[PDB]
Amino acid sequence: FVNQHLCGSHLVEALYLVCGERGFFYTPKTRRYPGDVKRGIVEQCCTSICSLYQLENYCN
């Protein structure tokens, strides 16, 4: 039984496994340019373990 922070390659793998259905758009705030080597969502789980309930909210 292990529980690493949802980040890096594991985070993307976790999103597809947690969302299950393949019809979710996963559209975030975008903030004009959604790049510039930054995300915010990853940092939140990188520093602390994110709860399953919050991941479900992002997967609308």
From Swiss-Prot:
Residue spans crossing the bilayer: none
Effect of residue 24 to S: In HPRI; Los-Angeles
Organism: Homo sapiens
Subcellular locations according to the entry: Secreted
Name of the featured protein: Insulin
Disease: Hyperproinsulinemia: An autosomal dominant condition characterized by elevated levels of serum proinsulin-like material.
General function of this protein: Insulin decreases blood glucose concentration. It increases cell permeability to monosaccharides, amino acids and fatty acids. It accelerates glycolysis, the pentose phosphate cycle, and glycogen synthesis in liver.
Gene: INS
Range of the intact protein held here: 25 to 110 of 110
Record annotation: effect of changing residue 22 to Q: In MODY10; reduces binding affinity to INSR; reduces biological activity; reduces folding properties
Subunit structure comment from the entry: Heterodimer of a B chain and an A chain linked by two disulfide bonds.
Domain of life: Eukaryota
